[PDB]
Amino acid sequence: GDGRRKMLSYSIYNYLAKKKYEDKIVIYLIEEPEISLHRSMQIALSKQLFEQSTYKYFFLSTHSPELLYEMDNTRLIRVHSTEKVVCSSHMYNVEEAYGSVKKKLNKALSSALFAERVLLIEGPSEKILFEKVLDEVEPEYELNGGFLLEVGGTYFNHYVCTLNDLGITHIIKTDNDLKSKKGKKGVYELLGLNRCLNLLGRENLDEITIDIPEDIKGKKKKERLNERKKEIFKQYKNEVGEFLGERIYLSEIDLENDLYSAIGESMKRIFENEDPVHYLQKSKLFNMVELVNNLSTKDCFDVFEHEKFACLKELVGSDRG
Amino acid sequence: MKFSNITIKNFRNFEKVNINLDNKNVIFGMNDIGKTNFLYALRFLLDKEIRKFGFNKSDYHKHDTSKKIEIILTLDLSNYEKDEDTKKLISVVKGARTSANADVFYIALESKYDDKELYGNIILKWGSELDNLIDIPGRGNINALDNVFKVIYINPGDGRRKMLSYSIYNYLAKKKYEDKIVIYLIEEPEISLHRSMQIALSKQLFEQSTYKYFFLSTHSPELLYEMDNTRLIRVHSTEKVVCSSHMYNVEEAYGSVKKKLNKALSSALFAERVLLIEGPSEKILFEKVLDEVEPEYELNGGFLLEVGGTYFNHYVCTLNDLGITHIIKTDNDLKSKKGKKGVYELLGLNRCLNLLGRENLDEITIDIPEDIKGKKKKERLNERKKEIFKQYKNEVGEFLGERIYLSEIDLENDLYSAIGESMKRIFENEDPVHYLQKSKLFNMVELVNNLSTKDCFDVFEHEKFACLKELVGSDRG
Amino acid sequence: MIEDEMSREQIIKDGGNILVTAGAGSGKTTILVSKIEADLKENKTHYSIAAVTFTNKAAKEIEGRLGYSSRGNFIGTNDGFVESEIIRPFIKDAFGNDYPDNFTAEYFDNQFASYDKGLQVLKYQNILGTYSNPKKNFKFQLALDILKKSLVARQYIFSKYFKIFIDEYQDSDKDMHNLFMYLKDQLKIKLFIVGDPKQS
Numbered sequence: 001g002d003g004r005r006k007m008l009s010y011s012i013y014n015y016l017a018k019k020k021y022e023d024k025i026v027i028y029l030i031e032e033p034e035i036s037l038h039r040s041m042q043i044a045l046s047k048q049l050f051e052q053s054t055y056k057y058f059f060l061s062t063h064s065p066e067l068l069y070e071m072d073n074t075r076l077i078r079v080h081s082t083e084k085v086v087c088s089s090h091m092y093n094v095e096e097a098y099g100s101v102k103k104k105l106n107k108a109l110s111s112a113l114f115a116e117r118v119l120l121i122e123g124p125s126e127k128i129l130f131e132k133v134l135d136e137v138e139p140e141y142e143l144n145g146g147f148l149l150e151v152g153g154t155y156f157n158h159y160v161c162t163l164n165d166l167g168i169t170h171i172i173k174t175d176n177d178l179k180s181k182k183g184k185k186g187v188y189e190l191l192g193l194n195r196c197l198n199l200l201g202r203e204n205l206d207e208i209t210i211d212i213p214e215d216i217k218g219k220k221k222k223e224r225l226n227e228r229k230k231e232i233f234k235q236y237k238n239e240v241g242e243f244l245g246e247r248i249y250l251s252e253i254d255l256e257n258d259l260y261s262a263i264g265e266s267m268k269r270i271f272e273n274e275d276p277v278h279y280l281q282k283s284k285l286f287n288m289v290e291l292v293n294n295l296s297t298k299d300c301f302d303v304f305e306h307e308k309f310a311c312l313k314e315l316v317g318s319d320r321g
Numbered sequence: 322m323k324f325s326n327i328t329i330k331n332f333r334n335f336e337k338v339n340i341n342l343d344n345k346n347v348i349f350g351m352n353d354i355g356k357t358n359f360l361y362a363l364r365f366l367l368d369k370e371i372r373k374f375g376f377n378k379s380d381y382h383k384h385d386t387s388k389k390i391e392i393i394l395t396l397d398l399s400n401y402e403k404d405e406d407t408k409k410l411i412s413v414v415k416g417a418r419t420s421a422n423a424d425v426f427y428i429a430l431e432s433k434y435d436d437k438e439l440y441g442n443i444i445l446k447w448g449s450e451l452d453n454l455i456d457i458p459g460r461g462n463i464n465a466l467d468n469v470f471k472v473i474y475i476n477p478g479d480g481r482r483k484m485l486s487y488s489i490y491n492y493l494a495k496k497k498y499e500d501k502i503v504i505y506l507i508e509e510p511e512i513s514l515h516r517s518m519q520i521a522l523s524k525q526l527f528e529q530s531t532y533k534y535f536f537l538s539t540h541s542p543e544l545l546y547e548m549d550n551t552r553l554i555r556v557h558s559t560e561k562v563v564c565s566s567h568m569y570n571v572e573e574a575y576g577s578v579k580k581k582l583n584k585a586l587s588s589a590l591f592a593e594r595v596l597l598i599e600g601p602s603e604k605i606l607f608e609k610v611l612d613e614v615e616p617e618y619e620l621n622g623g624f625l626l627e628v629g630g631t632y633f634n635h636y637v638c639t640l641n642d643l644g645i646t647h648i649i650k651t652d653n654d655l656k657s658k659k660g661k662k663g664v665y666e667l668l669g670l671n672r673c674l675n676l677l678g679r680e681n682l683d684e685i686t687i688d689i690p691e692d693i694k695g696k697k698k699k700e701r702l703n704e705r706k707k708e709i710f711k712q713y714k715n716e717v718g719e720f721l722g723e724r725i726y727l728s729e730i731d732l733e734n735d736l737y738s739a740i741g742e743s744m745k746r747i748f749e750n751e752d753p754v755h756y757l758q759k760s761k762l763f764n765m766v767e768l769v770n771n772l773s774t775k776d777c778f779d780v781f782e783h784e785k786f787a788c789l790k791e792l793v794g795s796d797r798g
Numbered sequence: 799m800i801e802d803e804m805s806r807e808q809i810i811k812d813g814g815n816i817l818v819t820a821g822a823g824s825g826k827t828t829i830l831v832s833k834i835e836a837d838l839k840e841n842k843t844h845y846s847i848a849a850v851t852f853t854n855k856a857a858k859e860i861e862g863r864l865g866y867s868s869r870g871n872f873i874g875t876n877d878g879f880v881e882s883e884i885i886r887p888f889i890k891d892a893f894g895n896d897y898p899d900n901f902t903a904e905y906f907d908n909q910f911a912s913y914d915k916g917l918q919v920l921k922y923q924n925i926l927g928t929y930s931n932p933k934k935n936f937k938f939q940l941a942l943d944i945l946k947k948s949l950v951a952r953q954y955i956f957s958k959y960f961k962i963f964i965d966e967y968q969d970s971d972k973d974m975h976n977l978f979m980y981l982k983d984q985l986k987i988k989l990f991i992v993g994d995p996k997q998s
């Protein structure tokens with residue numbers, strides 16, 4: 001048959017390299033090892049290729065994202081598809097702080113290494129909304145080398161340094177958050193602004209505090225936190241402009257307030273409430289599916305040619321000039 | 322008009338295998354299991370260049386050469402009007418059709434070994450009944466089956482030459498074979514192909530009308546990103562060769578989320594045991610626990626599938642018709658209705674009851690004082706979820722018998738039931754559950770940064786996390 | 799250029815029913831084989847044509863003028879076309895398995911002139927006779943009866959046969975005209991009829 005003959009031939013070559021060539025320096029040159037191979041055998045070959053010490057020196061050409069699931073301490077070379085043949089090199093390492101989330105990062109980055117323009121989103125609600133909008137506007141976005149990459153609970157530097165060293169265009173759409181500290185009441189740290197300032201090459205900002213009355217909670221406490229986020233986004237305006245020059249797109253409050261700025265009369269029509277923003281934020285997965293089941297054409301274009309959604313126009317690549 | 326069935330008896334690794342078919346068939350499976358021996362059964366039936374050499378000793382089941390090789394194909398033929406291919410079949414056959422059985426057709430292949438000339442002669446037949454199959458008439462090297470079907474077999478600088486050769490094969494099928502029924506047999510088209518070209522081949526193969534009939538064998542999940550109106554065939558890796566079939570369709574209710582479902586399910590079709598979870602927080606926690614306990618789980622055929630904002634029926638029907646083990650871990654939720662205050666619906670219990678084969682329950686109504694909000698409202702809702710989980714106990718037991726695992730309140734309360742001393746140690750609060758539930762994507766990373774060995778085992782051998790022991794597959798018996 | 803090429807564009811590129819008011823003979827065979835080779839040139843699908851004559855000498859002369867065709871085009875007499883295309887593949891599907899498949903036309907002994915005694919001597923003696931009236935056709939009436947009876951015969955001659963080219967219509971019976979009208983009106987087959995100016 002196939003496959004097991006190829007995996008037999010790998011063990012024949014590794015047995016001949018272990019036995020006959022103890023006195024020599026062995027370099028493997030592997031040309032496309034995913035051919036006629038199951039993906040579980042690709043993950044097994046990836047674990048043997050990056051974890052074991054029997055492949056000390058190799059050069060690997062591949063087309064498969066599932067065979068880069070175990071990558072660490074390697075050198076990634078990308079050949080660019082431009083008019084001049086440019087090779088870009090990156091020394092890929094995974095840090096000791098990221099060792100508990102290593103497999104998630106390697107699967108997500110290993111699918112994204114074979115792209116040209118990568119949009120970095122937070123969770124699956126952005127994936128549902130942007131897949132509906134990019135299905136209705138430009139449905140061949142992934143044929144042309146676009147990618148959607150959900151990066152949750154991380155500080156963006158690993159993905160941006162790996163894609164920036166390889167010549168792959170990274171776009172980040174995010175929002176500024178006020179995370180409450182553990183063991184402390186009333187003191188909120190600026191999460192999204194420190195993530196974007198850490199991407200720009202700055203230090204982390206100081207922990208701000210805001211005081212509320214104790215009976216004031218519920219929807220009113222979220223409105224006080226929203227106007228506090230609006231005052232932070234107003235006062236740090238020249239940092240937001242140089243985030244915007246470096247393809248970092250910070251929202252004022254959330255994604256939902258930008259969507260209410262774009263398609264908010266349709267959101268009042270669908271949800272039939274006076275607060276369509278709060279109703280989607282009560283349950284984010286089920287109400288985004290309920291919203292994208294009821295949008296159509298000329299709502300997705302209202303999302304796409306809005307000024308708060310220029311990350312999608314960067315991802316497609318259509319320019320006026 | 323339409324393929325319906327193929328029955329393969331006493332061939333190379335098929336003893337008696339019956340497969341329901343359609344147009345646009347996609348077959349998948351493991352290595353050395355018989356994917357390309359399925360396509361050689363179609364080459365020996367319908368292509369003359371394979372059929373002219375006969376059968377060897379090695380084409381018989383377990384080198385026996387005393388049984389008869391029999392390959393029978395069933396055609397549907399129910400639409401005589403408006404389809405030109407039914408007229409293309411009916412104008413050649415002329416004498417074995419019956420008006421009482423005018424909406425079925427059979428093309429059969431028989432072979433008995435000689436064991437003097439050392440040769441297996443192939444005799445082809447058609448008919449409209451399974452008894453009285455007359456021989457296909459022919460003169461010389463040409464019979465009348467070759468006047469109907471034309472079989473194009475595709476098997477692969479590089480890359481751009483193969484996509485040129487696809488256009489050469491489609492140009493020759495558009496120009497020279499207008500009067501014939503064309504069947505494509507494609508054997509692994511992901512070889513030396515970039516993944517954008519695989520998505521482009523998937524879109525051309527499933528959306529355009531230039532591939533009316535094909536049989537596709539593949540190993541690549543990116544070439545099933547656009548699958549719709551197809552027949553999925555899985556060859557099982559057991560001690561007996563079993564082929565399962567599913568008629569894959571995407572509903573009109575799921576048409577706005579079709580690409581997300583197709584990417585998530587197309588990665589999950591190449592597995593053996595699939596766990597269905599809700600979001601990425603379960604993915605982060607289960608990837609940390611399965612990294613610490615059984616780190617070769619995806620080598621052995623396990624898969625973590627995040628499904629969100631759906632009703633579980635599409636994935637369970639596709640994985641259950643293909644013979645793939647599906648495990649669902651979920652939690653019961655009280656979703657608030659739009660335009661109505663105080664009336665909730667029982668969302669996780671309705672999802673499990675819709676999976677089991679029942680109807681949705683009635684909308685419950687719980688009322689609260691208006692000043693009582695914040696953390697006390699969530700405690701009243703958790704006590705209402707506990708009363709729902711206590712009163713529907715015999716439904717929860719038969720969810721548990723069908724590998725559905727419904728939580729009492731949430732994942733986080735089960736995690737506090739397992740490792741909650743360590744959750745008190747890490748978060749240093751009196752409420753470790755609520756601090757985890759404030760920012761879910763950042764405190765789960767903060768939690769799994771600080772766990773180690775014997776906390777992941779306390780997650781793993783707990784009785785509220787038997788879905789992980791189902792996903793790995795380790796049994797005491 | 800001008801009216802000669804315009805008249806050739808009219809008389810070559812037709813697609814409908816053809817009825818030419820021309821005499822018997824006088825070069826009709828050359829324009830018939832020119833129409834047959836123009837219809838074989840102009841067709842690109844899987845359909846096939848039929849040619850019906852009376853004598854075997856004109857049939858082998860037409861087979862000499864065409865040569866070889868691999869499209870399944872039938873050229874022959876009317877009794878051979880009815881016997882090999884209508885009667886023999888569909889008698890077992892129309893009237894059951896009691897009637898024989900193979901049969902020979904021997905009309906030198908039986909002179910029976912009724913339909914009921916004809917059907918009981920195909921049932922019992924398994925041979926066919928001829929009528930005492932010479933303006934009769936038992937085989938064409940049997941072909942019309944089993945084309946009215948069978949569904950798959952109508953499906954086969956709707957799927958295969960496209961046009962029928964008829965020669966020597968001046969000496970014909972009304973049953974052949976009834977069967978050709980039954981092929982014309984329902985199953986959509988064009989007709990090419992040559993004839994006579996007056997009497998002859």
Ligand SMILES: Nc1ncnc2c1ncn2[C@@H]1O[C@H](COP(=O)(O)OP(=O)(O)OP(=O)(O)O)[C@@H](O)[C@H]1O
Binds near residue numbers: 003
């Ligand atoms: N005559 C025979 N008798 C018994 N077993 C046979 C015979 N011919 C083939 N086989 C078996 O059938 C299998 C042939 O593998 P095959 O190439 O069909 O698999 P596959 O699923 O297409 O593989 P891959 O995924 O690696 O491309 C082997 O297990 C072989 O032992």
Ligand SMILES: [Mg+2]
Binds near residue numbers: 002356357538
């Ligand atoms: Mg194979």
Ligand SMILES: [Mg+2]
Binds near residue numbers: 478513
């Ligand atoms: Mg190459």
